[PDB]
Amino acid sequence: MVPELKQISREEAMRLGPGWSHSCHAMLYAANPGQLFGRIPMRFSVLMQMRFDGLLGFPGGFVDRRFWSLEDGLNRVLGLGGGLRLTEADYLSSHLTEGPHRVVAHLYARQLTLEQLHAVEISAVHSRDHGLEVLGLVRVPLYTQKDRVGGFPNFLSNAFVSTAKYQLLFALKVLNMMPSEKLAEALASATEKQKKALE
Amino acid sequence: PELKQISREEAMRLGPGWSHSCHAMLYAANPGQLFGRIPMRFSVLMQMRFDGLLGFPGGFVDRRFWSLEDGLNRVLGLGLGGLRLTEADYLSSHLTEGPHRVVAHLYARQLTLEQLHAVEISAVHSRDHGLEVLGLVRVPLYTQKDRVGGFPNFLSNAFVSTAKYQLLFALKVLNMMPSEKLAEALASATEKQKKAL
């Protein structure tokens, strides 16, 4: 169980006054036919990143609406380097963050080929933001090993930007990349792992 | 969780029933400053593994046929891309928490920040990228004004237990961070984790 964030419509988000900050982040993913150890289907690979503050999050950042539309802003704030362009067709959701500052978090999601996803990873290591704001990209493992913790459940027990962890689970669910009951199982495994470490 | 440190010689005398792992801690002094005011001090490479945990580059070495160095370098050739370590880079051997019989050997090498970046570029092109290795990360060793941003948040991630111990061990014995500062970062990380729940 994660703390539920309030979802609002894009139209509502556009009506927000100047006292609201807007963040735009991108969930880039690819179908992945690979099989770990020749037997565990990887299904999809999703990109996240280690941030300067020691937490996992998505590529992106704050967008100043005095100057930019959400899409123009996002494409400018993507510390991936490259030629990838996101459009309003890739817009997925807007959620109000936990605060206390007034922030709406916009999520864009785009499916790429696995070769294109790798090109993004290569671009990122050469990016101006690498080693400053961004400390490295990681692929999310969506599979679970036989021990029932290796892979996705262990991954979910990492330290996230709270908004990004919610957005990841939200997107996996609404984009039909993972059944909800499987997400619940991985999250339960991660949360119990965390609780028993703290004992 | 204190691991028992033993000598290379002791490790070899445990016998054929023991497995050996070798991992490398690659790091660089880093003159950068976060926000132009927070000294970065050093950058250390770790990686996201296939099992969803942070660890160091490296893996199991079959000591029946391989020296620790040759074994390590072959695993690094597939997973980092051709950097080669020597016996001069050997740092420590620890018995891992049981019940499995594993001795964990740690190698450490200081690189320039330029050489460290070359390793990161090599890694994204390596054979193991997207299979056993899911991406490299730099450790943030600084702590932000809120006293959690940076190193304490980082320590609240999920690690191979042995690797987390090895990181803290190496930061101490290599004089990269004072013991009391490490203790302080760990305490903050724990307090973060408990309030997260």
Side-chain angles (χ1 to χ4, degrees), chain B residues 113-148:
Chain B
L113 200 54
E114 173 180 1
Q115 290 169 337
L116 200 74
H117 190 210
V119 170
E120 293 169 320
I121 294 161
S122 182
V124 299
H125 295 287
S126 84
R127 173 86 41 77
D128 289 329
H129 176 75
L131 295 179
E132 295 87 356
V133 182
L134 295 183
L136 288 196
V137 298
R138 293 185 185 185
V139 180
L141 282 184
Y142 49 81
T143 298
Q144 290 184 261
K145 290 186 180 171
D146 66 3
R147 298 310 278 164
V148 291

PDB file of all heavy atoms in Angstrom, chain B residues 113-148:
ATOM      1  N   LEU B 113      37.888  11.432 -12.636  1.00  0.00           N
ATOM      2  CA  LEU B 113      36.458  11.524 -12.923  1.00  0.00           C
ATOM      3  C   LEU B 113      36.247  11.235 -14.420  1.00  0.00           C
ATOM      4  O   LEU B 113      35.255  10.613 -14.805  1.00  0.00           O
ATOM      5  CB  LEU B 113      35.908  12.886 -12.492  1.00  0.00           C
ATOM      6  CG  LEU B 113      34.396  12.990 -12.271  1.00  0.00           C
ATOM      7  CD1 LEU B 113      33.900  11.924 -11.298  1.00  0.00           C
ATOM      8  CD2 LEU B 113      34.064  14.393 -11.761  1.00  0.00           C
ATOM      9  N   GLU B 114      37.213  11.620 -15.258  1.00  0.00           N
ATOM     10  CA  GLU B 114      37.171  11.297 -16.685  1.00  0.00           C
ATOM     11  C   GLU B 114      37.190   9.789 -16.971  1.00  0.00           C
ATOM     12  O   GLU B 114      36.450   9.285 -17.834  1.00  0.00           O
ATOM     13  CB  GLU B 114      38.375  11.950 -17.391  1.00  0.00           C
ATOM     14  CG  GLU B 114      38.557  11.568 -18.847  1.00  0.00           C
ATOM     15  CD  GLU B 114      39.773  12.246 -19.478  1.00  0.00           C
ATOM     16  OE1 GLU B 114      40.486  13.000 -18.766  1.00  0.00           O
ATOM     17  OE2 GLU B 114      40.030  11.998 -20.673  1.00  0.00           O
ATOM     18  N   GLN B 115      38.048   9.068 -16.255  1.00  0.00           N
ATOM     19  CA  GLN B 115      38.143   7.620 -16.404  1.00  0.00           C
ATOM     20  C   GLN B 115      36.867   6.961 -15.877  1.00  0.00           C
ATOM     21  O   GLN B 115      36.401   5.974 -16.428  1.00  0.00           O
ATOM     22  CB  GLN B 115      39.365   7.080 -15.649  1.00  0.00           C
ATOM     23  CG  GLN B 115      40.696   7.498 -16.317  1.00  0.00           C
ATOM     24  CD  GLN B 115      41.897   7.204 -15.439  1.00  0.00           C
ATOM     25  OE1 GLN B 115      41.776   7.095 -14.221  1.00  0.00           O
ATOM     26  NE2 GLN B 115      43.072   7.127 -16.050  1.00  0.00           N
ATOM     27  N   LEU B 116      36.318   7.508 -14.801  1.00  0.00           N
ATOM     28  CA  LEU B 116      35.065   6.969 -14.244  1.00  0.00           C
ATOM     29  C   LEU B 116      33.935   7.087 -15.273  1.00  0.00           C
ATOM     30  O   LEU B 116      33.145   6.149 -15.475  1.00  0.00           O
ATOM     31  CB  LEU B 116      34.686   7.687 -12.950  1.00  0.00           C
ATOM     32  CG  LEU B 116      33.704   6.926 -12.048  1.00  0.00           C
ATOM     33  CD1 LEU B 116      34.440   5.770 -11.375  1.00  0.00           C
ATOM     34  CD2 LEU B 116      33.070   7.844 -10.999  1.00  0.00           C
ATOM     35  N   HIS B 117      33.878   8.235 -15.947  1.00  0.00           N
ATOM     36  CA  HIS B 117      32.867   8.451 -16.970  1.00  0.00           C
ATOM     37  C   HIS B 117      33.080   7.500 -18.142  1.00  0.00           C
ATOM     38  O   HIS B 117      32.121   6.965 -18.694  1.00  0.00           O
ATOM     39  CB  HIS B 117      32.873   9.921 -17.424  1.00  0.00           C
ATOM     40  CG  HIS B 117      31.711  10.288 -18.297  1.00  0.00           C
ATOM     41  ND1 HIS B 117      31.783  11.271 -19.261  1.00  0.00           N
ATOM     42  CD2 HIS B 117      30.454   9.785 -18.361  1.00  0.00           C
ATOM     43  CE1 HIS B 117      30.612  11.371 -19.872  1.00  0.00           C
ATOM     44  NE2 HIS B 117      29.791  10.476 -19.350  1.00  0.00           N
ATOM     45  N   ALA B 118      34.338   7.247 -18.509  1.00  0.00           N
ATOM     46  CA  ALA B 118      34.626   6.270 -19.558  1.00  0.00           C
ATOM     47  C   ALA B 118      34.100   4.866 -19.201  1.00  0.00           C
ATOM     48  O   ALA B 118      33.615   4.124 -20.056  1.00  0.00           O
ATOM     49  CB  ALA B 118      36.141   6.232 -19.839  1.00  0.00           C
ATOM     50  N   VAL B 119      34.173   4.504 -17.926  1.00  0.00           N
ATOM     51  CA  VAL B 119      33.629   3.227 -17.464  1.00  0.00           C
ATOM     52  C   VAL B 119      32.116   3.191 -17.646  1.00  0.00           C
ATOM     53  O   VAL B 119      31.542   2.199 -18.114  1.00  0.00           O
ATOM     54  CB  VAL B 119      33.958   2.989 -15.978  1.00  0.00           C
ATOM     55  CG1 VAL B 119      33.176   1.784 -15.450  1.00  0.00           C
ATOM     56  CG2 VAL B 119      35.452   2.787 -15.806  1.00  0.00           C
ATOM     57  N   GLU B 120      31.463   4.286 -17.273  1.00  0.00           N
ATOM     58  CA  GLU B 120      30.004   4.385 -17.418  1.00  0.00           C
ATOM     59  C   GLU B 120      29.565   4.277 -18.877  1.00  0.00           C
ATOM     60  O   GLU B 120      28.568   3.638 -19.184  1.00  0.00           O
ATOM     61  CB  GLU B 120      29.495   5.700 -16.844  1.00  0.00           C
ATOM     62  CG  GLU B 120      29.642   5.792 -15.339  1.00  0.00           C
ATOM     63  CD  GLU B 120      29.372   7.191 -14.852  1.00  0.00           C
ATOM     64  OE1 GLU B 120      29.797   8.148 -15.531  1.00  0.00           O
ATOM     65  OE2 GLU B 120      28.705   7.344 -13.812  1.00  0.00           O
ATOM     66  N   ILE B 121      30.324   4.903 -19.771  1.00  0.00           N
ATOM     67  CA  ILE B 121      30.033   4.811 -21.200  1.00  0.00           C
ATOM     68  C   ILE B 121      30.260   3.387 -21.694  1.00  0.00           C
ATOM     69  O   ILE B 121      29.438   2.836 -22.436  1.00  0.00           O
ATOM     70  CB  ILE B 121      30.888   5.812 -22.021  1.00  0.00           C
ATOM     71  CG1 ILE B 121      30.483   7.248 -21.681  1.00  0.00           C
ATOM     72  CG2 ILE B 121      30.729   5.539 -23.521  1.00  0.00           C
ATOM     73  CD1 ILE B 121      31.545   8.295 -22.059  1.00  0.00           C
ATOM     74  N   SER B 122      31.362   2.769 -21.275  1.00  0.00           N
ATOM     75  CA  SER B 122      31.602   1.380 -21.621  1.00  0.00           C
ATOM     76  C   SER B 122      30.471   0.460 -21.127  1.00  0.00           C
ATOM     77  O   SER B 122      30.070  -0.479 -21.812  1.00  0.00           O
ATOM     78  CB  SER B 122      32.947   0.919 -21.042  1.00  0.00           C
ATOM     79  OG  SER B 122      33.206  -0.416 -21.421  1.00  0.00           O
ATOM     80  N   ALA B 123      29.967   0.716 -19.920  1.00  0.00           N
ATOM     81  CA  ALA B 123      28.959  -0.162 -19.329  1.00  0.00           C
ATOM     82  C   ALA B 123      27.657  -0.188 -20.135  1.00  0.00           C
ATOM     83  O   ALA B 123      27.046  -1.238 -20.290  1.00  0.00           O
ATOM     84  CB  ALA B 123      28.681   0.245 -17.877  1.00  0.00           C
ATOM     85  N   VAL B 124      27.236   0.945 -20.681  1.00  0.00           N
ATOM     86  CA  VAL B 124      25.964   0.943 -21.403  1.00  0.00           C
ATOM     87  C   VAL B 124      26.091   0.161 -22.714  1.00  0.00           C
ATOM     88  O   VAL B 124      25.093  -0.312 -23.248  1.00  0.00           O
ATOM     89  CB  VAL B 124      25.442   2.383 -21.708  1.00  0.00           C
ATOM     90  CG1 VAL B 124      25.196   3.159 -20.428  1.00  0.00           C
ATOM     91  CG2 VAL B 124      26.374   3.132 -22.629  1.00  0.00           C
ATOM     92  N   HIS B 125      27.319  -0.012 -23.201  1.00  0.00           N
ATOM     93  CA  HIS B 125      27.569  -0.814 -24.413  1.00  0.00           C
ATOM     94  C   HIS B 125      27.981  -2.267 -24.146  1.00  0.00           C
ATOM     95  O   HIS B 125      28.262  -3.020 -25.077  1.00  0.00           O
ATOM     96  CB  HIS B 125      28.661  -0.156 -25.263  1.00  0.00           C
ATOM     97  CG  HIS B 125      28.273   1.174 -25.818  1.00  0.00           C
ATOM     98  ND1 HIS B 125      27.373   1.315 -26.856  1.00  0.00           N
ATOM     99  CD2 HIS B 125      28.668   2.429 -25.493  1.00  0.00           C
ATOM    100  CE1 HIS B 125      27.226   2.596 -27.137  1.00  0.00           C
ATOM    101  NE2 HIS B 125      28.000   3.294 -26.322  1.00  0.00           N
ATOM    102  N   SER B 126      28.057  -2.652 -22.880  1.00  0.00           N
ATOM    103  CA  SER B 126      28.552  -3.980 -22.502  1.00  0.00           C
ATOM    104  C   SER B 126      27.550  -5.083 -22.784  1.00  0.00           C
ATOM    105  O   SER B 126      26.344  -4.840 -22.881  1.00  0.00           O
ATOM    106  CB  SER B 126      28.928  -4.014 -21.023  1.00  0.00           C
ATOM    107  OG  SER B 126      27.770  -4.263 -20.240  1.00  0.00           O
ATOM    108  N   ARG B 127      28.061  -6.309 -22.868  1.00  0.00           N
ATOM    109  CA  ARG B 127      27.238  -7.484 -23.119  1.00  0.00           C
ATOM    110  C   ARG B 127      26.160  -7.721 -22.055  1.00  0.00           C
ATOM    111  O   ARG B 127      25.060  -8.205 -22.367  1.00  0.00           O
ATOM    112  CB  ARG B 127      28.169  -8.709 -23.203  1.00  0.00           C
ATOM    113  CG  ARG B 127      27.502 -10.070 -23.300  1.00  0.00           C
ATOM    114  CD  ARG B 127      27.179 -10.421 -24.750  1.00  0.00           C
ATOM    115  NE  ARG B 127      28.244 -10.057 -25.692  1.00  0.00           N
ATOM    116  CZ  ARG B 127      29.377 -10.739 -25.859  1.00  0.00           C
ATOM    117  NH1 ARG B 127      29.620 -11.821 -25.137  1.00  0.00           N
ATOM    118  NH2 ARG B 127      30.276 -10.334 -26.748  1.00  0.00           N
ATOM    119  N   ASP B 128      26.437  -7.327 -20.814  1.00  0.00           N
ATOM    120  CA  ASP B 128      25.515  -7.630 -19.719  1.00  0.00           C
ATOM    121  C   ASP B 128      24.445  -6.563 -19.516  1.00  0.00           C
ATOM    122  O   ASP B 128      23.521  -6.757 -18.728  1.00  0.00           O
ATOM    123  CB  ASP B 128      26.266  -7.858 -18.400  1.00  0.00           C
ATOM    124  CG  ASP B 128      27.048  -9.170 -18.388  1.00  0.00           C
ATOM    125  OD1 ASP B 128      26.607 -10.135 -19.052  1.00  0.00           O
ATOM    126  OD2 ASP B 128      28.066  -9.259 -17.666  1.00  0.00           O
ATOM    127  N   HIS B 129      24.576  -5.437 -20.208  1.00  0.00           N
ATOM    128  CA  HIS B 129      23.616  -4.358 -20.048  1.00  0.00           C
ATOM    129  C   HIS B 129      22.223  -4.797 -20.488  1.00  0.00           C
ATOM    130  O   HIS B 129      22.026  -5.232 -21.635  1.00  0.00           O
ATOM    131  CB  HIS B 129      24.032  -3.131 -20.849  1.00  0.00           C
ATOM    132  CG  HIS B 129      23.021  -2.031 -20.782  1.00  0.00           C
ATOM    133  ND1 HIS B 129      22.867  -1.245 -19.664  1.00  0.00           N
ATOM    134  CD2 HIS B 129      22.069  -1.642 -21.658  1.00  0.00           C
ATOM    135  CE1 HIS B 129      21.873  -0.389 -19.865  1.00  0.00           C
ATOM    136  NE2 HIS B 129      21.372  -0.613 -21.069  1.00  0.00           N
ATOM    137  N   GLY B 130      21.267  -4.683 -19.569  1.00  0.00           N
ATOM    138  CA  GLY B 130      19.882  -5.048 -19.824  1.00  0.00           C
ATOM    139  C   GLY B 130      19.599  -6.513 -19.565  1.00  0.00           C
ATOM    140  O   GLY B 130      18.482  -6.991 -19.771  1.00  0.00           O
ATOM    141  N   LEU B 131      20.617  -7.231 -19.109  1.00  0.00           N
ATOM    142  CA  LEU B 131      20.437  -8.613 -18.679  1.00  0.00           C
ATOM    143  C   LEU B 131      20.758  -8.719 -17.202  1.00  0.00           C
ATOM    144  O   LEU B 131      19.884  -8.516 -16.367  1.00  0.00           O
ATOM    145  CB  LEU B 131      21.331  -9.558 -19.474  1.00  0.00           C
ATOM    146  CG  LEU B 131      21.035  -9.670 -20.963  1.00  0.00           C
ATOM    147  CD1 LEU B 131      22.026 -10.624 -21.596  1.00  0.00           C
ATOM    148  CD2 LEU B 131      19.600 -10.150 -21.174  1.00  0.00           C
ATOM    149  N   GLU B 132      22.012  -9.010 -16.869  1.00  0.00           N
ATOM    150  CA  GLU B 132      22.389  -9.090 -15.455  1.00  0.00           C
ATOM    151  C   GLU B 132      22.546  -7.722 -14.792  1.00  0.00           C
ATOM    152  O   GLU B 132      22.407  -7.615 -13.567  1.00  0.00           O
ATOM    153  CB  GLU B 132      23.682  -9.892 -15.282  1.00  0.00           C
ATOM    154  CG  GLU B 132      23.551 -11.373 -15.679  1.00  0.00           C
ATOM    155  CD  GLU B 132      23.803 -11.629 -17.164  1.00  0.00           C
ATOM    156  OE1 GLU B 132      24.007 -10.651 -17.933  1.00  0.00           O
ATOM    157  OE2 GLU B 132      23.789 -12.821 -17.559  1.00  0.00           O
ATOM    158  N   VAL B 133      22.873  -6.703 -15.591  1.00  0.00           N
ATOM    159  CA  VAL B 133      23.118  -5.342 -15.095  1.00  0.00           C
ATOM    160  C   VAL B 133      22.082  -4.406 -15.709  1.00  0.00           C
ATOM    161  O   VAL B 133      21.953  -4.319 -16.935  1.00  0.00           O
ATOM    162  CB  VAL B 133      24.538  -4.854 -15.455  1.00  0.00           C
ATOM    163  CG1 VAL B 133      24.800  -3.456 -14.883  1.00  0.00           C
ATOM    164  CG2 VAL B 133      25.575  -5.834 -14.918  1.00  0.00           C
ATOM    165  N   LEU B 134      21.367  -3.674 -14.857  1.00  0.00           N
ATOM    166  CA  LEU B 134      20.260  -2.862 -15.326  1.00  0.00           C
ATOM    167  C   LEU B 134      20.575  -1.367 -15.332  1.00  0.00           C
ATOM    168  O   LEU B 134      19.736  -0.559 -15.718  1.00  0.00           O
ATOM    169  CB  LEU B 134      19.016  -3.151 -14.483  1.00  0.00           C
ATOM    170  CG  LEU B 134      18.495  -4.590 -14.635  1.00  0.00           C
ATOM    171  CD1 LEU B 134      17.232  -4.773 -13.826  1.00  0.00           C
ATOM    172  CD2 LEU B 134      18.272  -4.934 -16.116  1.00  0.00           C
ATOM    173  N   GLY B 135      21.802  -1.001 -14.974  1.00  0.00           N
ATOM    174  CA  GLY B 135      22.239   0.391 -15.098  1.00  0.00           C
ATOM    175  C   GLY B 135      23.216   0.705 -13.982  1.00  0.00           C
ATOM    176  O   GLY B 135      23.130   0.114 -12.921  1.00  0.00           O
ATOM    177  N   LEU B 136      24.165   1.606 -14.227  1.00  0.00           N
ATOM    178  CA  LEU B 136      25.115   2.018 -13.206  1.00  0.00           C
ATOM    179  C   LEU B 136      24.564   3.267 -12.528  1.00  0.00           C
ATOM    180  O   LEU B 136      23.884   4.071 -13.169  1.00  0.00           O
ATOM    181  CB  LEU B 136      26.473   2.331 -13.843  1.00  0.00           C
ATOM    182  CG  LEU B 136      27.389   1.226 -14.383  1.00  0.00           C
ATOM    183  CD1 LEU B 136      28.807   1.772 -14.587  1.00  0.00           C
ATOM    184  CD2 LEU B 136      27.403  -0.046 -13.568  1.00  0.00           C
ATOM    185  N   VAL B 137      24.867   3.457 -11.246  1.00  0.00           N
ATOM    186  CA  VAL B 137      24.540   4.697 -10.574  1.00  0.00           C
ATOM    187  C   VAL B 137      25.768   5.234  -9.849  1.00  0.00           C
ATOM    188  O   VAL B 137      26.623   4.463  -9.389  1.00  0.00           O
ATOM    189  CB  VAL B 137      23.383   4.525  -9.562  1.00  0.00           C
ATOM    190  CG1 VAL B 137      22.103   4.082 -10.281  1.00  0.00           C
ATOM    191  CG2 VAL B 137      23.774   3.511  -8.467  1.00  0.00           C
ATOM    192  N   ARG B 138      25.887   6.552  -9.774  1.00  0.00           N
ATOM    193  CA  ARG B 138      26.888   7.153  -8.880  1.00  0.00           C
ATOM    194  C   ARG B 138      26.302   7.366  -7.494  1.00  0.00           C
ATOM    195  O   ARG B 138      25.174   7.850  -7.349  1.00  0.00           O
ATOM    196  CB  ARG B 138      27.370   8.497  -9.422  1.00  0.00           C
ATOM    197  CG  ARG B 138      28.155   8.381 -10.701  1.00  0.00           C
ATOM    198  CD  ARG B 138      28.684   9.762 -11.094  1.00  0.00           C
ATOM    199  NE  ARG B 138      29.349   9.689 -12.392  1.00  0.00           N
ATOM    200  CZ  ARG B 138      29.998  10.706 -12.946  1.00  0.00           C
ATOM    201  NH1 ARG B 138      30.073  11.871 -12.304  1.00  0.00           N
ATOM    202  NH2 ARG B 138      30.565  10.562 -14.140  1.00  0.00           N
ATOM    203  N   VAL B 139      27.072   7.028  -6.471  1.00  0.00           N
ATOM    204  CA  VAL B 139      26.664   7.295  -5.096  1.00  0.00           C
ATOM    205  C   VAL B 139      26.826   8.786  -4.774  1.00  0.00           C
ATOM    206  O   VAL B 139      27.911   9.319  -4.981  1.00  0.00           O
ATOM    207  CB  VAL B 139      27.528   6.485  -4.105  1.00  0.00           C
ATOM    208  CG1 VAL B 139      27.090   6.763  -2.641  1.00  0.00           C
ATOM    209  CG2 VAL B 139      27.509   4.974  -4.458  1.00  0.00           C
ATOM    210  N   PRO B 140      25.767   9.462  -4.281  1.00  0.00           N
ATOM    211  CA  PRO B 140      25.943  10.829  -3.764  1.00  0.00           C
ATOM    212  C   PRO B 140      26.479  10.756  -2.319  1.00  0.00           C
ATOM    213  O   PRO B 140      25.825  10.139  -1.481  1.00  0.00           O
ATOM    214  CB  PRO B 140      24.529  11.414  -3.836  1.00  0.00           C
ATOM    215  CG  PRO B 140      23.615  10.217  -3.637  1.00  0.00           C
ATOM    216  CD  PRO B 140      24.372   8.993  -4.158  1.00  0.00           C
ATOM    217  N   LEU B 141      27.662  11.302  -2.046  1.00  0.00           N
ATOM    218  CA  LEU B 141      28.260  11.175  -0.707  1.00  0.00           C
ATOM    219  C   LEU B 141      27.976  12.388   0.174  1.00  0.00           C
ATOM    220  O   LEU B 141      28.244  12.377   1.387  1.00  0.00           O
ATOM    221  CB  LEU B 141      29.774  10.951  -0.809  1.00  0.00           C
ATOM    222  CG  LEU B 141      30.297   9.560  -1.166  1.00  0.00           C
ATOM    223  CD1 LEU B 141      31.829   9.583  -1.108  1.00  0.00           C
ATOM    224  CD2 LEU B 141      29.736   8.466  -0.238  1.00  0.00           C
ATOM    225  N   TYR B 142      27.436  13.434  -0.440  1.00  0.00           N
ATOM    226  CA  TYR B 142      27.075  14.654   0.268  1.00  0.00           C
ATOM    227  C   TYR B 142      25.725  14.515   0.969  1.00  0.00           C
ATOM    228  O   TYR B 142      24.934  13.616   0.662  1.00  0.00           O
ATOM    229  CB  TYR B 142      27.031  15.822  -0.719  1.00  0.00           C
ATOM    230  CG  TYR B 142      26.227  15.492  -1.957  1.00  0.00           C
ATOM    231  CD1 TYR B 142      24.842  15.574  -1.955  1.00  0.00           C
ATOM    232  CD2 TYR B 142      26.856  15.049  -3.116  1.00  0.00           C
ATOM    233  CE1 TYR B 142      24.101  15.240  -3.086  1.00  0.00           C
ATOM    234  CE2 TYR B 142      26.117  14.716  -4.250  1.00  0.00           C
ATOM    235  CZ  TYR B 142      24.747  14.823  -4.221  1.00  0.00           C
ATOM    236  OH  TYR B 142      24.019  14.493  -5.339  1.00  0.00           O
ATOM    237  N   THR B 143      25.442  15.430   1.885  1.00  0.00           N
ATOM    238  CA  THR B 143      24.130  15.468   2.513  1.00  0.00           C
ATOM    239  C   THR B 143      23.582  16.875   2.353  1.00  0.00           C
ATOM    240  O   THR B 143      24.290  17.853   2.601  1.00  0.00           O
ATOM    241  CB  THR B 143      24.191  15.070   4.005  1.00  0.00           C
ATOM    242  OG1 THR B 143      24.668  13.722   4.129  1.00  0.00           O
ATOM    243  CG2 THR B 143      22.814  15.158   4.631  1.00  0.00           C
ATOM    244  N   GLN B 144      22.328  16.983   1.933  1.00  0.00           N
ATOM    245  CA  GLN B 144      21.707  18.289   1.738  1.00  0.00           C
ATOM    246  C   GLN B 144      21.323  18.938   3.059  1.00  0.00           C
ATOM    247  O   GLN B 144      21.434  18.323   4.115  1.00  0.00           O
ATOM    248  CB  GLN B 144      20.470  18.168   0.850  1.00  0.00           C
ATOM    249  CG  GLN B 144      20.805  17.843  -0.599  1.00  0.00           C
ATOM    250  CD  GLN B 144      19.574  17.815  -1.473  1.00  0.00           C
ATOM    251  OE1 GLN B 144      19.046  16.752  -1.772  1.00  0.00           O
ATOM    252  NE2 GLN B 144      19.096  18.987  -1.872  1.00  0.00           N
ATOM    253  N   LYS B 145      20.858  20.180   2.977  1.00  0.00           N
ATOM    254  CA  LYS B 145      20.513  20.974   4.156  1.00  0.00           C
ATOM    255  C   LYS B 145      19.423  20.330   4.996  1.00  0.00           C
ATOM    256  O   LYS B 145      19.430  20.461   6.215  1.00  0.00           O
ATOM    257  CB  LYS B 145      20.091  22.383   3.724  1.00  0.00           C
ATOM    258  CG  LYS B 145      21.242  23.215   3.193  1.00  0.00           C
ATOM    259  CD  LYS B 145      20.835  24.656   2.912  1.00  0.00           C
ATOM    260  CE  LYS B 145      22.022  25.453   2.382  1.00  0.00           C
ATOM    261  NZ  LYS B 145      21.644  26.809   1.881  1.00  0.00           N
ATOM    262  N   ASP B 146      18.495  19.616   4.358  1.00  0.00           N
ATOM    263  CA  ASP B 146      17.433  18.924   5.089  1.00  0.00           C
ATOM    264  C   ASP B 146      17.934  17.665   5.817  1.00  0.00           C
ATOM    265  O   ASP B 146      17.162  16.966   6.475  1.00  0.00           O
ATOM    266  CB  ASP B 146      16.276  18.563   4.144  1.00  0.00           C
ATOM    267  CG  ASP B 146      16.664  17.534   3.073  1.00  0.00           C
ATOM    268  OD1 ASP B 146      17.811  17.038   3.062  1.00  0.00           O
ATOM    269  OD2 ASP B 146      15.793  17.201   2.244  1.00  0.00           O
ATOM    270  N   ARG B 147      19.229  17.397   5.688  1.00  0.00           N
ATOM    271  CA  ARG B 147      19.913  16.285   6.345  1.00  0.00           C
ATOM    272  C   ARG B 147      19.461  14.882   5.896  1.00  0.00           C
ATOM    273  O   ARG B 147      19.815  13.888   6.532  1.00  0.00           O
ATOM    274  CB  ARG B 147      19.773  16.411   7.872  1.00  0.00           C
ATOM    275  CG  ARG B 147      20.413  17.684   8.443  1.00  0.00           C
ATOM    276  CD  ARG B 147      21.852  17.895   7.953  1.00  0.00           C
ATOM    277  NE  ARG B 147      22.827  17.114   8.713  1.00  0.00           N
ATOM    278  CZ  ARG B 147      24.076  16.885   8.312  1.00  0.00           C
ATOM    279  NH1 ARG B 147      24.505  17.374   7.155  1.00  0.00           N
ATOM    280  NH2 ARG B 147      24.896  16.167   9.070  1.00  0.00           N
ATOM    281  N   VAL B 148      18.707  14.789   4.800  1.00  0.00           N
ATOM    282  CA  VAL B 148      18.396  13.467   4.234  1.00  0.00           C
ATOM    283  C   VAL B 148      18.738  13.365   2.751  1.00  0.00           C
ATOM    284  O   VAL B 148      19.104  12.287   2.286  1.00  0.00           O
ATOM    285  CB  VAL B 148      16.902  13.064   4.421  1.00  0.00           C
ATOM    286  CG1 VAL B 148      16.583  12.802   5.887  1.00  0.00           C
ATOM    287  CG2 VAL B 148      15.958  14.099   3.822  1.00  0.00           C
TER     288      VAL B 148
END
